[PDB]
């Protein structure tokens, strides 16, 4: 049941994917010790509106409340910015966005340290992105999904660290949300031959101590349950006729945009 996109599909795809790494590019500057996460989002949300002229995914989601989701330290995902929320230093901070444009969607993610980084700070978020990029190297018709989650457990549990079982990538398209579930682990529920046209994201959440994580009152936020510390990136892709194309790129990211095999 995932449907394929049309090159006229994926050539949306690619401006609204654009149009997300660009706000985290525009944002970086400001990410510094004693700003709020509210200031943050209202800075994002101003630039996709009034600069992008496009919006939010997250803004009103399903009663989501902000337009981008900023989790810190041990803080796992869906982080709701907050103007008494204050970054300081040592933090380790996740920032995730995702616009629509022209009824296509782009999510994606990364990490950014305040001032000067902890050692385990350091050494996690570089794991987790590296991670990521195992997995994007993966990517090809033919392979089944499942291999990429194991590839990327192996990978990680080897650094002595843990993945987030609960929460994991998506499809993604004219939704938010669509088929398939892009697990970060192996399991037995994954069973999906991927094919050309096929979009989807990839979002490891990897955490320093153990996997499990606990809901907040809040409804949204998901931290650890051992208060360890965890980190996530997210890229989203189109599978091509011999491997993939990244949508989301920065020019901070050290990976070519075209994955050819
Ligand atoms: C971690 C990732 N994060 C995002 O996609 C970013 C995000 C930003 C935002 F502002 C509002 C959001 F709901 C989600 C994620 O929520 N993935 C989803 C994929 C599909 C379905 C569900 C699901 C669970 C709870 C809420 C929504 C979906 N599960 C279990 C997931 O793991
Ligand atoms: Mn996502």
Not at 206 to 217: D, L, P, Q, S, Y
């Amino acid at each position: 049941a995932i449907s394929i996109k049309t090159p006229e599909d994926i050539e949306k795809m690619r401006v609204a994917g654009r149009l997300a790494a660009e706000v985290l590019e525009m944002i970086e500057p400001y990410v510094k010790p004693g700003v709020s996460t509210g200031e943050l989002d209202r800075i994002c949300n101003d630039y996709i509106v009034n600069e992008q002229h496009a919006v939010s995914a997250c803004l009103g989601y399903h009663g989501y409340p902000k337009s981008v989701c900023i989790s810190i330290n041990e803080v796992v995902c869906h982080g709701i910015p907050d103007d008494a929320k204050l970054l300081k230093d040592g933090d380790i901070v996740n920032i995730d966005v995702t616009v629509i444009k022209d009824g296509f969607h782009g999510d994606t993610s990364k990490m950014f340290i305040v001032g000067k980084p902890t050692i385990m700070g350091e050494r996690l978020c570089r794991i987790t992105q590296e991670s990521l990029y195992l997995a994007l190297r993966m990517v090809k018709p033919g392979i089944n999904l499942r291999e990429i989650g194991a590839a990327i457990q192996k990978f990680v549990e080897a650094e002595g660290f843990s993945v987030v079982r609960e929460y994991c990538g998506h499809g993604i398209g004219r939704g938010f949300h669509e088929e398939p579930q892009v697990l970060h682990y192996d399991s037995r529920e994954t069973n999906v031959v991927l094919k050309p046209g096929m979009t989807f994201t990839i979002e490891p959440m990897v955490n320093a101590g153990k996997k499990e994580i606990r809901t907040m009152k809040d409804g949204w936020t998901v931290k650890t349950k051992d208060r360890s510390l965890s980190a996530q990136y997210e890229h989203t892709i189109v599978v091509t006729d011999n491997g993939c194309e990244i949508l989301t790129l920065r020019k901070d990211d050290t990976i070519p945009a075209i994955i050819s095999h």
